[PDB]
Amino acid sequence: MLGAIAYTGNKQSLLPELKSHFPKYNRFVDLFCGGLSVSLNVNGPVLANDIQEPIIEMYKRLINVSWDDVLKVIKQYKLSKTSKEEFLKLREDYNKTRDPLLLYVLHFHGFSNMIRINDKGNFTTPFGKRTINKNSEKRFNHFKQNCDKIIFSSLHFKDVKILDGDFVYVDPPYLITVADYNKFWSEDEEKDLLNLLDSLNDRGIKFGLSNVLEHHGKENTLLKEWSKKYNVKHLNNGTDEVYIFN
Amino acid sequence: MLGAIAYTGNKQSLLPELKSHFPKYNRFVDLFCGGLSVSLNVNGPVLANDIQEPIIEMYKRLINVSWDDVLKVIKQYKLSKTSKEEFLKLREDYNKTRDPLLLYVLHFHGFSNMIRINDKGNFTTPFGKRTINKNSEKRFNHFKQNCDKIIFSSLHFKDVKILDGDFVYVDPPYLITVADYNKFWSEDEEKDLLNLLDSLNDRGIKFGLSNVLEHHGKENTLLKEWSKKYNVKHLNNGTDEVYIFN
DNA sequence: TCACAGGATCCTGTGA
DNA sequence: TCACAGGATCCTGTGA
Ligand SMILES: Nc1ncnc2c1ncn2[C@@H]1O[C@H](C[C@@H](N)CC[C@H](N)C(=O)O)[C@@H](O)[C@H]1O
Ligand SMILES: Nc1ncnc2c1ncn2[C@@H]1O[C@H](C[C@@H](N)CC[C@H](N)C(=O)O)[C@@H](O)[C@H]1O
């Protein structure tokens, strides 16, 4: 139940409790997928979408690389737990070539495996005093053994077109919380998502949305109310982890 | 790829993408140079010109000062993040003596490191609740290790005599935008620059001009059209950052 | 004088 | 108890 890469917000753990609610579908849509904690572990076909083209091209790529391919690039850069400059180079190189395979290595050495990218589309995460380890290849493998049941998409959720008959799984940025990618989020976003989430219901299209109603101080009222029109399955400084669905 | 001093409009970041277009030259001309983000980082010889003699004399000066020289003047004024009056003094002193080294310290405590000067030639930037920090000396050093490949000029661009064989790099005030130094700018200026920029072309002299075609709602049509006669390499509330060149 | 890009890490679940 | 993998923030410098 591993994700292809370590990823902030990943769901490895909750998938179990999360599948217990999944309806049937002709296509599984992972609207916001990042880590692929879900996609790599649901029943095909899977439309894995995420707005971050870098991470999505990185997947498209990975499909044909091999663990050796990977190991090679590392040896070639002589990267390791304390290789700060070797890192900074690999960064520059990515930034220039925009070669997906390189992003995949970097993510292994970033500060807390963060994959942060800027306006200009550059990888800017600071060194993280780390490199690959056991799970590295396990993650690597697991990806390669399951990605063939996936189709990758890199569109704003509001553009993925949902067909009638597929199941949509939403796990977007949590308003109240703050991971890096919340830079792509706002209330105006929480809104369109929630309104369109409605649309999908009227079209008799089943959906599943994981999020937090309260975390660390503030609360998501907009959804706290919206959440009524549909179900709920509370899961939780205490943050209330829920699964709002139909 | 640091500039000698923090500076509004600086190009630290775009230099990379900007060098990828630089032609060959016997002399690099930095027509409008302020921050020295470019000059300090191109291949000598470099004719760094800027109209603001204060900032230019400040450089001519700096050539012989030492980080200690610098630190000294600070200690001597007991300046720091909250030293508002100590600041105001250092200001007066500059205003009176017109001693370049002092301007260099001030710039470190100005509101947003602005180096604003008036008709009477006085430093008038308000206190900025700040003083030196890490980058201060880095900036300081980088200047001192590269300035020897530079010749400083403080003339209106329309006078900086261009020789046949050098490359001219233009990055003047952006019409549509408004930094302090746009006080030296106008359409009549955009014009002379553009017309003379033509002249340089006819003389078979290569030139490079960074600017914005559109920012914050308005647009620079005069150049939007003029920009056709030559190349373009779009880089970008969205502002369109471009590099018009031959 | 705040909005923003960008260098930074301990606290924690978990196999041993 | 113990080592290791893994992350829904942090602070500081900076200003078209
Ligand atoms: N407008 C948007 N459209 C699509 N994806 C977005 C948007 N804003 C943010 N995201 C992505 O939404 C994701 C949120 C994550 N918590 C998804 C986690 C994922 N299901 C996992 O378990 O690995 C990230 O991968 C973000 O890059
Ligand atoms: N007529 C003029 N002649 C020469 N310089 C001028 C004139 N009007 C304005 N300037 C200067 O042109 C500059 C525009 C700046 N954006 C140059 C930035 C510089 N390339 C840097 O990145 O540090 C300022 O330093 C202004 O002081």
**Which stretches within chain B are classed as H helix?**
15-19, 53-62, 67-77, 84-97, 100-106, 134-146, 187-202, 221-226
Is B78 in contact with B44 (CB distance < 8 Å)?
no
Place of tokens 């970097």: A106
Q: Does domain A1-51+147-246 have CATH number 3.40.50.150?
A: yes
| Peptide bond just before B45 cis, omega within 30 deg | yes
Q: What DSSP state is assigned to residue B126?
A: P
Residue B23: C-alpha distances to residues B27, B160, B165 (Å): 11, 20, 10
Residue limits of CATH 1.10.1020.10 in chain A: 52-146
B229 C-alpha to ligand 2 centroid (Å): 24
CATH match of B52-146 with 3.60.40.10: no
A180 C-alpha to ligand 1 centroid (Å): 10
Where does chain B hold its CATH 3.40.50.150 domain(s)?
1-51+147-246
Phi, psi of B117 (to 5 degrees): -130, 140
A51 lines ligand 1 (CB under 6 A): yes
Instruction: Indicate if ligand 1 lies below 6 Å from the C-beta of A181.
Output: yes
Alpha-carbon distance of B25 to B48, in angstroms, equals: 15
- B123 phi/psi in degrees, rounded to 5: -70, 120
- Residues making up the binding site of B: 7, 11, 32-37, 50, 156-157, 171, 181
* Resolution of the entry in angstroms: 3.1
Identify the experimental approach.
X-ray
Q: Are A123 and A116 in contact (CB under 8 A)?
A: yes
Which of helix, strand or coil describes residue A56?
helix
Asked whether B37 lines ligand 2 (CB < 6 A), one says: yes
Q: Amino acid letter at A151?
A: I
DSSP-based three-state secondary structure for B139: helix
